From a paper:
While Sirt2 features an NAD+-dependent catalytic mechanism and belongs to class III HDACs, also referred to as sirtuins, HDAC6 is a Zn2+-dependent lysine deacylase and has been classified as a class IIb HDAC.
To obtain structural insights into the HDAC6 binding modes of the dual Sirt2/HDAC6 inhibitors 32 and 33, we submitted 55 and 57, which represent the HDAC6-targeted subunits of 32 and 33, respectively, for crystallization trials with HDAC6. The HDAC6–55 complex crystallized in space group P21 with one monomer in the asymmetric unit. The hydroxamate N–O– group coordinates to the catalytic Zn2+ ion with a Zn2+–O separation of 2.0 Å. Additionally, the phenolic hydroxyl group of Y745 forms poorly oriented hydrogen bonds with the hydroxamate C=O and NH groups. The phenyl subunit of 55 is sandwiched between F583 and F643, making staggered π-stacking interactions. The carbonyl of the inhibitor capping group accepts a hydrogen bond from a nearby water molecule and is positioned 3.6 Å away from a molecule of ethylene glycol.
Author numbering: 442 to 798
């Protein structure tokens, strides 16, 4: 029972040259890596090497136009980097951004291959920039290519096209790119939990609402769990996993589990405003390990409080390594609004998932 880990400091080169304090900091991944060292987690892992994704692997999910444009930014002067970045919603670009997005995706491909060939049971990928807001034809929300989506398609390309992949997105934002890439696809189940507030939270679209259940053959295979009405924490996330995430996942029976693991729902993050604890994330990980014979890959997305993301992702790697789940703090009763959300998702997905109660 071996846990893999992939990290490469070259992904720190991506940076905002007009705001050195932009929250999507190079030091996100370095701080996480150091905490793994300090807690003696890194030494217990098998170290998976990082690599560049190829242009053909990007074509698994992204259009040739979008690859061509981001690729061209490697040679742009700062004035053009600024112009191009402003053509997207919430994007900054440097000369290293294209290469770092390649490394993030390729690092995850290597970890998926390591899991699928039996070299490791599960794995953690400490990567940046994130991916789950990137769509087929455009970058968005600090994301250039959709790393989690590309990894699912990569996993299928090296096994069989019908490989059942579950993607759990517990980043506090809706992974619009991941939903849309797989919207008509019943081979990849997308489950996202996210702050919604009636469509006023980034990325500010009703695409994130519970009633978007998929299209065509993929009806039932897109599960949005939207939060309305202020701060949520461990009790709401534990209830959502108990009533929705784990019953649907068990009925889907994935062969590989990818976590789009933002840590911006963590206590202390200003961009999320939630208070999921490191012990909370440990329990979420431990539940997911009961699926897919333990084939779980945890992929960093967002998460912007440096101390919070370091403690929270370390807690996840500790669970993958087999440590006992930590004792949870007091679980306050479910906020009425959280009950409403879980009930809305249950009602919307009752047709597709016979397990639901
Ligand atoms: C200031 C602001 O709200 N900018 C928009 C925005 C915010 C967060 C993300 C993200 O990726 N979070 O994990 C992306 C875009
Ligand atoms: K999410
Ligand atoms: K789907
Ligand atoms: Zn986020």
């Amino acid at each position: 029972p071996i846990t893999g880990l992939v990290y490469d400091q070259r992904m720190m080169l991506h940076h905002n040259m007009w705001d050195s304090h932009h929250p999507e900091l190079p030091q996100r991944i370095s701080r996480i890596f150091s905490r793994h060292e300090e807690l003696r987690l890194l030494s217990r892992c098998h170290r998976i090497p990082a690599r560049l994704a190829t242009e053909e692997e990007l074509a698994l999910c992204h259009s040739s136009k979008h690859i061509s444009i981001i690729k061209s930014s490697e040679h742009m002067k700062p004035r053009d980097l600024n112009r191009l970045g402003d053509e997207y919603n919430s994007i900054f670009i440097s000369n290293e951004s294209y290469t770092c997005a390649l490394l993030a995706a390729g690092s995850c491909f290597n970890s998926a291959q390591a899991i699928l060939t039996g070299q490791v049971r599960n794995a953690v990928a400490i990567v940046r920039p994130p991916g789950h807001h990137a769509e087929k034809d455009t970058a968005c929300g600090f994301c250039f290519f959709n790393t989690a989506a590309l990894t699912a398609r990569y996993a299928q390309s090296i096994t069989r096209e019908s490989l059942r992949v579950l993607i759990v997105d517990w980043d506090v934002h809706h992974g619009n790119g991941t939903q849309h890439i797989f919207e008509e696809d019943d081979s990849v189940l997308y489950i996202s939990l996210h702050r919604y507030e009636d469509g006023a939270f980034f990325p500010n679209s009703e695409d994130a609402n519970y009633d978007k259940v998929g299209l065509g053959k993929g009806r039932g295979y897109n599960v949005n769990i939207p939060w309305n009405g202020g701060k949520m924490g461990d009790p709401e996330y534990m209830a959502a996993f108990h009533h929705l995430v784990m019953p649907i996942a068990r009925e889907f029976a994935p062969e590989l589990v990818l976590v789009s693991a933002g840590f911006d729902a963590a206590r202390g993050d200003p961009l999320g405003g939630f208070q999921v604890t490191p012990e909370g994330y440990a329990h979420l990980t431990h539940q997911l390990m009961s699926l897919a014979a333990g084939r779980v890959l945890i992929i960093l997305e967002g998460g912007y409080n440096l101390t919070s993301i370091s403690e929270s992702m370390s807690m996840c790697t500790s669970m993958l390594l087999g440590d006992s789940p930590p004792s949870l703090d007091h679980l306050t009763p479910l906020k009425t609004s959280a009950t409403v959300s879980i009930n809305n998702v249950l009602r919307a997905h009752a047709p597709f998932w016979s397990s639901l109660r």
